[PDB]
């Protein structure tokens, strides 16, 4: 038999802090890192997708996950929590659609998202979500970028890095990338960006990449990518 | 309403009309009544209007959930299977008559989904009130492994005797042909019935009309 | 459809005296126009000194019997006496109005002794509206017994008669009487009948034959 | 002393504090006995009071007609109990219009207090039965710990410095099954008396008696209905 | 170190029922004497300013015209216990038509007894025992009966008890001068004594309360002027 | 609806019309009538199609798990007491008249009959459906024990056929099939194969 | 019937770049008038209007939870909303009632904000939407109103000859129902501006 | 139950010298279509008492699986007890009366026999909890047929010896397949004794039909 | 072997180095208590219990280790005895249970199964404690044959040829690994049991003792019984004989 522990397991510091968040934070970034870039026409999420082993179906389990058909996700921290919070964004996308009958935007998703991760900081017997997440789509014209940290607080971002070395893959993105860059441009940057730290030969099956312009969200294929990790094309 | 559905050599044809009425008065000359469910699966619905439509949304809603965790196309059986269940649970209060259409990896397949939550699967299905008009010239001028074009002939011929010899039925027809790789949502197949030309001009002149109070709102 | 009731018959008579309480009913258990049996009577001992009769649905008399037996005992264990006559009246009351909505098919007649030793009869309604009564009789032939009993022990229009107090034994003969003329003309009210007599000595039982048309 | 506070946690060397520390509840009340011959089954208790001014607590509480018990312990619990036998002795004369078996009582008893002892901030029920009945199976003696195990008694006695009534009623044990109720009454006075310094005895005041056998319900004597039974005693010297 | 409400001391009782029993010895102290005259119940008001109304302050309240209770301790957690009390007579009286008997009413009190605990309860349920002693004095077949309750739930009758802070002191006290065949007008008398020994103020009318329950009389809550009237034969 | 069962040594029989109607209008006139349960066991059906079609789904499913828990081929007697349990808590909700009928290497081929009420019976043949009324005497008749498969097989073939002949709300197709040890042996008898009875003519 | 009980009409008809809405103004109990300025129109943001008739109560309820629900909308989302959007809210809160519907029969008019294209719709009492490109109607002429949309309404209408159709077509359809009328009212709606006009008309 | 569906008919019992015997006939019918003709409507309940059942025979078979699992589960303590034919009678009674008090019925009429202690038990329990105890009994129409027959006999000669009550019953049994259009030729007689509960297989009762001859005069 | 850092007071908590010490406590409860044994044939199976006697007050027969579980189901414990007994009734629920919904008696494996599922429950949570128990359930049918099986405090259920629980498993072990059963009869077996209990027993340490005795076979009917006071008192004689060598 069983109940459940009613408290919460996240409490305030003395010094002010929701200790169980930040230590949330740090299992974010001690992840493999994640970039994406808002590009004028469509939006790039891309991250390490570097297993352990050759012995890993790489075709099996993806880190870029679509939503809908026209909203993506990809995660820095722990794997099942991403699971989670991914089935739930489509829940939540299609009861959106259920109601609407339109296709759920960007900020909304964001939102109810960020709402559901909130939860698990203040209500009882659970901890918080090891996981940030990027997310991508494209709604009344406009593309968009945004990311979710495990406070339940989010984020719009013109081009952003989570995981390791986020600092340094941000800085690299603030210098060398900016606006009017068409989804090509903004992929190779983001590649560029991923490369920073992808310590080892970077193949094509070394990475993950989704798109989003206002053709819906997809992820590209292993050959598209090894096309444009021919640092070319 | 009269809509039907056929099983051909490389896929299925969805048909139905286009008239919507409230009681014994047309509502809708262009009422649409083939739904999506899957890219691959299609769902005509006869009965009460907005169960049917509420239904076949619900499921297509969670459908998409479906192989969007599978990464594959969905099966009709599953569709069939859901719907079955969802209205054998409300013991035929919620008032969806279904003809439901698709192609799997296991081919095309046709089901004819009835309120009370009973299904037959069968190579040809008429629903609605001109049901057994359509269902007369399936049983008359139905062959096994048709070809595309003559089984699209066969349906907007089965819609057609529906529209003119049932009372619930008229206005155009609808086809939806789904094959093994392709997909042809002709929306509508082809109107057999107009409206007469207007013979007079009934237009009533600028100021035809007394008005006893205006206010004039500007927006922006 | 399905109905939850059955008419079973039975007729029921109690009487209050200075001393005693009688308590008589028959003993036939009928259905339609057939016996089930001719040994089934309707009164039942609850303490030393009360005994009820029950008249109606039998499947409702029988569920009710027990549940006072229960409460009987429930009472005693929480209070470490016995009910009085009054406080079983009382609890029957609020048993009977607990079915407010779906009430047992059960006419009552409790008898017996008061704390001062003085006969008590208390009649109901299925609902449990109750009250003190000198005489009451319940049942099919409620209506045969109780003009008699309002003439030959109330005195009621007769003029220029002693009042003089109910003896047991002019009690027991009149009992015996109205039941005999009962089933005469009563086809639910024959077979035998059970008369419990209650004094300060204790219950005594008495069997008397009714005719078995 | 961290296996101490919850009956959930086992210790490192397979005990369960809690239990024990309920078991002591029991050797906390004034002690109790209980014998049956063949014929009869007989609880004797000695009642206790706080001052003189003050009554002697009850001991002994009816449940059935054939039923009765001896309590050790919380009084609370044991009246929680005593009501949960009673509720059950009803329900069988409801449904069978049979008296209940009294195995099956004891039974019951054991699957109920056992429940508490698994479940986390549930305590066990502080009190030690001995049950007295009579059914098809003859008189019977039975005895429940807070540990929620039960025992089929000879004869048993429990309570504050029971150890001495236990070493008595072990000696005479042969003697009970052939004993009239007079001597199985005064045997267990006896056991009870053995309790007790050579200061304090028995008497009509400070003991209760319940009986119950195969021409005798179940049926409590205090006060003055004791005295019959304790007149006709040997005044044991120290 | 924080345990569960319901952990077992290695003695072998309940900590919050003992912490309960210590919490008692803080209260006002409370002397009922039973007599076959009646029962009589006397409490010191312990007013703690000029400026409270001593009215106010009722340790000894009417369970039923029949029954009367004094108590000691926490007397918010004791009003709940009265009312428990008064709702159970009025259902006794409702469904058999007579009056409760003492022990019946104390016993239904008691039954509130170890009603506490965490998990596995309703969300209404106590989380403490009630920090309370109590003195039910009352008349019925039986006659004038007296019965004394404690957080342990375990009630029991008493000829003459105390309860409170110089409870040992007044119990001594009380045996002292108790025999089955005082008057009420000596049991009133000793009461007001001994109390009159442990109250640290100076006893008066308005210092004190006093009420008696007669087999002829209904529960009495006795009057200032009647209170002066036995205060004058000190 | 006409289904029938008869049991013989090595398994048993199964035969159902194929005419499922709603008022008198034919719906569907090529129904399966006859659905597996598990791997050797069978159920005809009979009365609301919503009803028995969501029943056997039902049964199919929890003996599906049951025989996966247990690891043994599941008892015919098992299949029918799970039928036997839905049809009879929620008989006031339903109207199914079911057939269970299948092989079983514990107790051999068995037919158990469960109606409208929730009862169950275990027969040597059994009928059911609206068509069943018109051949009771035939089978009765007819029936001879110890019969063989194939002898079975012409049964039930010949019973059914008669039934269609003379109820409405039967006719269309005749479904067979066999049910042994050695497995499923389904067929389909249409048209001038449906066997033929002496019309009365002057 | 329960439509019927308090009667009433509603109407909406495309033109141009321009949209029309009305109602009749009488709210009655069965034959009994009570009030001649009964609202049964509600604006539901700039440019987009809803109408409902029926069952009077269920016409205000079902406005009023709607307005709620909206306003809701434009809080979480920074931007007004989209007419088949308000159609889907609707029908999904019509179809929440599927077992215990309100009587009210909507009707939606209005312009796409972001563009300016004419949008009309009416729904079931459940919530089954039909979108037109003519007209729509509801209310206890119905009938009537289908009479005179269908032979009064042309394709490309502006502004001024909307207004003379809606009000004529409401005008003639109402004056042959003797539960709908006491007096018109019309709102009609293009890009820059809107005019509310009551009509002229019978009061018996 | 609301609508009984399988049905069947009157079921007998006589109490004799130390034992107690129970006729029914093994017809279920449905409606007036003599459905299965041969299922039994009688239950050994433990070794001193046996149950017999007019009405739905598909609650008959959930009676007769609650009692059996009654039954084990008794009989699983093996502490000297075992449950009394009165006993029986009494939960069955309080059972039926639960059921009707909830207005969904088990649509039954039961007879149960018994010998326990010497002494005879038989016991009528219907479907609204009404419930008795007498020397004979009989369901359906043999409250009408075979009763009065049965207390004829019992009123001259209320001792029976264990043939005169099986040749009292197969009488019986035989006026109700003549005047009973839903019995059937075929049934069941139990007796208890202190040996236990014998179930005796399918009897015929032997007719007779000189009285066709009889049309003219 | 031993870490007791707060990581031995809930089930619902690992150890670091991979153990639920909570289980193993209710083990080591398993332990400490006196010895059962079970030994399956080839026509049945059957229990011996060592029940020790903490007093000559008790009646003989009280505080039985020996269950009817179903009618064709026998069980005998280890450990703390009302857990085995809130186990007891549990297995007869789900023997009934399975009665009422399938209508045949339950398969041995699967009771075991089930019981040990809901005893596996408890070795999760923190709200509830593991059972103190060991049990072993007998069992034998003509389409099943004889089976016997064992269910530890973890939740784990093993079927065996021969079995032991408590203080002395391994030495009773020993002793029962001598005996070729496959072959013997129940009959023949009893004995055995009896004396590998007496032998097993320590008369020093645990005083008095009480010998239970259950069969469950061909000789039965399938029906789980207690063994007659004859064939009990003839396999103690024997034991008592065979413990003089």
Same mark, same amino acid.
């Given at each position: ?9 996240? %409490? ?31 939006? =790039?999420?891309? %991250? ?25 996700? =990809?995660?820095?921290?722990?794997? !099942? ?23 759920? !935007? ?64 941000? %800085? ?62 | ?176 042909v789904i094959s093994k790789n392709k997909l042809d949502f002709l929306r509508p197949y082809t109107v057999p019935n107009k409206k007469g030309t207007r013979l007079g001009r009934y237009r009533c002149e600028k100021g035809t009309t007394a008005v006893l109070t205006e206010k004039i709102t500007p927006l922006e | 459809r399905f109905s939850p009731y059955v008419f079973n ?205 | ?27 906390? /009340? ?42 050790? /312990? ?51 029920? /502080? ?85 119950? /056998? ?25 | ?234 | ?202 | ?204 | ?217 | ?144 044959? &004889? ?24 030495? &009773? ?34 005083? &008095? ?37």
């Open positions: 038999a069983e109940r459940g522990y009613s408290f919460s397991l996240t %409490t305030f510091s003395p010094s002010g802090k929701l200790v169980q968040i930040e230590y949330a934070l740090a299992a974010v970034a001690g992840g493999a890192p994640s970039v994406g870039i808002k590009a004028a026409n469509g939006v =790039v999420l891309a %991250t390490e997708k570097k297993q352990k082993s050759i012995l890993y179906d790489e075709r099996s389990v993806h880190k870029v996950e679509p939503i809908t058909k026209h909203i993506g996700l =990809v995660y820095s921290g722990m794997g !099942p929590d991403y699971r989670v919070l991914v089935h739930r964004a489509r829940k939540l996308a299609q009861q959106y659609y259920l109601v609407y009958q339109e296709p759920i !935007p960007t900020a909304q998703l964001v939102q109810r998202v960020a709402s559901v991760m909130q939860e698990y900081t203040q209500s009882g017997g659970v901890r918080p979500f090891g996981v940030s997440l990027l997310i991508c789509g494209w709604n009344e014209g406009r593309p968009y970028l945004f990311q979710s940290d495990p406070s339940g607080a989010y984020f719009a971002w013109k081009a952003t890095a989570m995981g390791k070395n986020y600092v340094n893959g941000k %800085t690299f993105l603030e210098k060398r990338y900016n606006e009017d860059l068409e989804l090509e441009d903004a992929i190779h940057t983001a590649i560029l960006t991923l490369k920073e730290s992808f310590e080892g030969q970077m193949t094509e099956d070394n990475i993950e990449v989704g798109i989003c312009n206002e053709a819906g969200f997809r992820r590209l294929t292993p050959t598209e990518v090894k096309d444009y990790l021919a640092a070319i094309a | 309403t009269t809509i039907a559905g056929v099983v051909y050599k490389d896929g299925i044809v969805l048909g139905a009309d286009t008239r919507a009425t409230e009681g014994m008065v047309v509502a809708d000359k262009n009422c649409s009544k083939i739904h999506f469910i899957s890219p691959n699966i299609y769902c005509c619905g006869a009965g009460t209007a907005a169960d049917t439509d509420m239904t076949t949304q619900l499921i297509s809603s969670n459908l998409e959930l479906h192989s969007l965790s599978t990464g594959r196309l969905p099966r009709v059986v599953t569709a069939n299977r859901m719907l079955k269940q969802m209205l054998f649970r409300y013991q035929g209060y919620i008032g969806a008559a279904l003809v439901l259409g698709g192609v799997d990896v296991t081919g095309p397949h046709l089901y004819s989904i009835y309120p009370h939550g009973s299904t037959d699967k069968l190579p040809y299905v008429t629903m609605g009130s001109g049901s057994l008009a359509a269902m007369a010239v399936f049983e008359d001028k139905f062959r096994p492994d048709m070809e595309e074009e003559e089984a699209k002939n066969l349906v907007s011929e089965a819609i057609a005797a529906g529209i003119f010899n049932d009372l619930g039925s008229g206005s155009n027809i609808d086809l939806c | 018959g039975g007729t029921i008579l109690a009487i209050a005296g200075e001393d005693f309480a009688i308590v008589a009913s028959d003993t036939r258990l009928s259905e339609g126009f057939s016996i089930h049996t001719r040994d089934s009577p309707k009164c039942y001992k609850l303490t030393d000194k009360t005994v009820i009769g029950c008249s109606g649905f039998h499947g409702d008399c029988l569920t009710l019997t027990k549940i006072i037996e229960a409460r009987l005992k429930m009472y005693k264990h929480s209070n470490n006496k016995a009910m009085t006559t009054g406080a079983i009246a009382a609890m029957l009351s609020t048993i009977l109005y607990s079915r407010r909505f779906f009430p047992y098919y059960v006419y009552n007649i409790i008898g017996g002794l008061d704390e001062e030793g003085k006969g008590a009869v208390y009649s109901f309604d299925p609902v449990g509206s109750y009250q003190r009564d000198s005489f009451k009789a319940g049942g099919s032939a409620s209506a045969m017994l109780q003009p008699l009993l309002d003439n030959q022990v109330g005195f009621k229009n007769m003029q220029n008669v002693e009042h003089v107090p109910l003896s047991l034994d002019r009690a027991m003969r009149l009992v015996k009487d109205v039941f005999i003329s009962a089933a005469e003309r009563d086809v639910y009210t024959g077979d035998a009948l059970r008369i419990c007599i209650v004094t300060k000595e204790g219950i005594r039982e008495e069997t008397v034959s009714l005719r078995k048309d | 002393n961290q296996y101490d506070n919850d009956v959930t946690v086992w210790s490192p060397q397979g005990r369960i504090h809690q239990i024990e520390y309920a078991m002591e509840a029991v050797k906390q /009340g004034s002690a109790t006995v209980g014998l049956k011959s063949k014929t009869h089954a007989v609880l004797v208790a000695l009642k206790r009071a706080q001052s003189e001014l003050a009554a002697h607590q009850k001991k002994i509480l009816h449940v059935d007609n054939h039923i009765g018990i001896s309590i050790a /312990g919380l009084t609370a619990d044991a009246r929680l109990l005593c009501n949960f036998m009673r509720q059950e002795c009803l329900d069988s004369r409801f449904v069978f219009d049979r008296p209940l078996p009294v195995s099956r009582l004891v039974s019951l008893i054991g699957s109920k207090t056992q429940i508490p002892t698994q479940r986390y901030g549930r305590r066990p029920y /502080g009190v030690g039965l001995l049950i007295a009945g009579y059914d098809d199976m003859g008189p019977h003696i039975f005895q429940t710990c807070p540990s929620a195990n039960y025992f089929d008694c000879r004869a048993m006695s429990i309570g504050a410095r029971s150890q001495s009534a236990r070493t008595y009623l072990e000696r005479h044990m042969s003697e009970f099954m052939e004993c009239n109720l007079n001597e199985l009454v005064k045997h267990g006075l006896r056991a009870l008396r053995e309790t007790l310094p050579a200061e304090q005895d028995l008497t009509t005041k400070n003991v209760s008696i319940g009986i119950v /056998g195969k021409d005798l319900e179940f049926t409590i004597y205090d006060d003055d209905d004791v005295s019959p039974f304790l007149e006709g005693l040997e005044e044991r010297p120290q | 170190y924080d345990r569960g409400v319901n952990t077992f001391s290695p003695e072998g009782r309940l900590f919050q029922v003992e912490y309960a029993i210590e919490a008692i010895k803080l209260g006002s102290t409370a002397i009922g004497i039973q007599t076959s005259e009646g029962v009589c119940l006397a409490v010191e008001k312990r007013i703690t300013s000029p400026l409270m109304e001593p009215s106010s302050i009722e340790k000894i309240v009417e369970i039923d015209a029949h029954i009367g209770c004094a108590m000691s301790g926490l007397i918010a957690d004791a009003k709940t216990l009265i009312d428990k009390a008064r709702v159970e007579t009025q259902n006794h009286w409702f469904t058999y038509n007579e009056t409760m008997t003492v022990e019946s009413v104390t016993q239904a009190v008691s039954n509130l007894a170890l009603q506490f605990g965490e998990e596995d309860a309703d969300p209404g349920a106590m989380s403490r025992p009630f920090g309370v002693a109590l003195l039910f004095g009352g008349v019925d077949e039986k006659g004038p009966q007296l019965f004394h309750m404690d957080p342990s739930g375990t009630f029991v009758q008493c000829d003459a008890r105390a309860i409170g802070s110089a409870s040992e002191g007044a119990q001594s006290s009380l045996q002292e001068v108790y025999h089955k065949s005082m008057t009420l007008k000596e049991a009133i008398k000793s009461s007001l004594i001994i109390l009159k020994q442990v109250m640290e103020e100076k006893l008066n009318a308005t210092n004190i309360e006093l009420a008696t329950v007669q087999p002829g009389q209904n529960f009495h809550m006795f009057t200032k002027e009647e209170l002066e009237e036995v205060i004058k034969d000190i | 609806t006409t289904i029938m069962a008869v049991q013989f040594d090595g398994g048993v029989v199964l035969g159902a019309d194929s005419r499922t109607t709603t008022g008198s209008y034919i719906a569907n006139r090529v129904t399966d009538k006859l659905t597996p349960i598990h791997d050797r066991i069978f159920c005809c059906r009979s009365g609301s199609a919503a009803d028995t079609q969501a029943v056997a789904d039902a049964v199919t499913y929890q003996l599906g798990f049951h025989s996966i828990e247990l690891n043994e081929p599941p008892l015919v007697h098992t299949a029918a007491s799970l039928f036997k349990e839905m049809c009879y808590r929620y008989r006031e909700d339903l109207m199914a008249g079911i057939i269970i009928a299948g092989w079983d290497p514990q107790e051999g081929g068995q037919v158990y009959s469960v109606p409208m009420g929730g009862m169950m019976v275990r027969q040597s043949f059994a009928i059911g459906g609206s068509g069943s009324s018109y051949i009771y005497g035939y089978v009765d008749a007819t029936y001879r024990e110890g019969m063989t498969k194939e002898e079975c097989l012409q049964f039930t073939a010949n019973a059914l056929a008669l039934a269609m002949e003379r109820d409405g709300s039967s006719g269309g197709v005749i479904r067979l099939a066999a049910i042994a040890e050695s497995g499923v042996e389904r067929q389909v008898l249409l048209g001038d194969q449906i066997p033929k009875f002496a019309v009365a003519t002057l | 019937s329960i439509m019927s009980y308090n009667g009433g009409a509603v109407m909406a008809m495309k033109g141009k770049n321009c949209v029309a809405i009305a109602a009749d103004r009488r709210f009655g109990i069965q034959a009994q008038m009570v009030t001649t300025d009964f609202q049964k129109i509600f604006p539901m943001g700039d440019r987009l209007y809803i109408g409902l008739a029926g069952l009077a109560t269920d016409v205000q309820t079902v406005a009023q939870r709607l307005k709620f629900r909206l306003n809701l909308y434009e809080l979480k989302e920074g931007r007004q909303i989209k007419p088949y959007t308000l159609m889907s809210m609707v029908a999904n809160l019509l179809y929440e009632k599927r077992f215990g519907p309100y009587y009210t029969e909507p009707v939606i008019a209005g312009l796409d904000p972001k563009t300016f294209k004419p949008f009309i719709c009416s729904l079931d009492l459940i919530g089954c939407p039909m979108v037109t490109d003519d007209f729509v109607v509801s209310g206890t002429c119905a009938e009537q109103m289908y009479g005179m949309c269908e032979s009064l309404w042309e394709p490309n209408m502006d502004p001024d000859h909307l207004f003379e159709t809606i009000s004529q077509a409401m005008l003639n359809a109402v004056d042959r129902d003797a539960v709908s009328g006491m007096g018109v009212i019309v709102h009609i709606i293009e890009k820059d501006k809107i005019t509310t006009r009551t009509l002229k008309a019978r009061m018996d | 139950t609301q609508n009984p569906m399988v049905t069947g008919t009157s079921v007998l019992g006589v109490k004799f010298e130390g034992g107690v015997v129970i006729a029914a006939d093994m017809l279920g019918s449905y409606g007036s279509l003599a459905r299965f003709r041969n299922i039994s409507r009688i239950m050994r309940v433990n070794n001193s008492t046996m149950l017999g059942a007019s009405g739905d025979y598909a609650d008959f078979q959930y009676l007769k699986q609650v009692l059996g699992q009654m039954v084990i589960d008794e009989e699983l303590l093996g502490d000297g007890h075992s449950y009394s034919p009165r006993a029986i009678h009494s939960w069955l009674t309080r059972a039926m009366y639960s059921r009707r008090s909830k207005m969904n019925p088990l649509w039954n009429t039961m007879v149960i026999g018994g010998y326990a202690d010497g002494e005879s038990f038989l016991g009528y329990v219907d479907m609204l909890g009404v419930a008795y105890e007498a020397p004979s009994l009989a369901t359906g129409y043999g409250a009408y047929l075979a009763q009065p027959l049965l207390r004829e006999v019992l009123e001259k000669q209320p001792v029976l010896s264990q043939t005169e009550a099986r040749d009292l019953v197969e009488r019986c049994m035989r006026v109700l397949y003549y005047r009973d259009a839903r019995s059937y030729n075929r049934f069941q007689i139990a007796t208890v004794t202190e040996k236990g509960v014998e179930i005796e297989g399918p009897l015929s009762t032997e007719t007779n039909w000189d009285i066709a001859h009889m049309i003219s005069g | 072997s031993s870490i007791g850092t707060g990581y031995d007071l809930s089930a619902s908590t690992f150890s670091p180095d991979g153990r639920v010490f909570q289980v193993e406590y209710a083990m080591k409860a398993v332990e400490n208590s006196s010895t059962a044994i079970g030994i399956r044939c080839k026509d049945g199976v059957v229990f011996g219990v060592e029940k020790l006697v903490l007093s000559k007050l008790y009646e003989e027969g009280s505080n039985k280790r020996l269950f009817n579980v179903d009618r064709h189901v026998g069980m005998a414990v280890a450990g703390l005895l009302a857990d085995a007994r809130s186990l007891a009734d549990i297995a007869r629920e789900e023997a009934s249970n399975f009665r009422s919904n399938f209508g045949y008696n339950i398969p041995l494996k699967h009771l075991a199964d089930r019981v040990a599922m809901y005893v596996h429950a408890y070795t999760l949570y923190s709200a509830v404690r593991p059972f103190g128990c060991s049990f072993m359930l007998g069992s034998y049918s003509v389409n099943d044959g &004889a089976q016997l099986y064992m269910i530890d405090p973890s939740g784990v259920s093993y079927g065996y040829w021969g079995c032991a629980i408590g203080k002395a498993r391994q030495a &009773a072990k020993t002793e029962i690994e001598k005996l070729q059963m496959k072959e013997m009869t129940c009959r023949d077996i009893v004995k055995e049991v009896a004396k590998i209990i007496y032998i097993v027993h320590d008369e020093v340490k645990d005083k &008095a003792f009480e010998l239970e005795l259950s069969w469950v076979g061909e000789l039965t009917n399938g029906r789980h019984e207690i063994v007659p006071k004859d064939i009990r008192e003839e396999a103690e004689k024997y034991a008592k004989e065979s413990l003089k060598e």
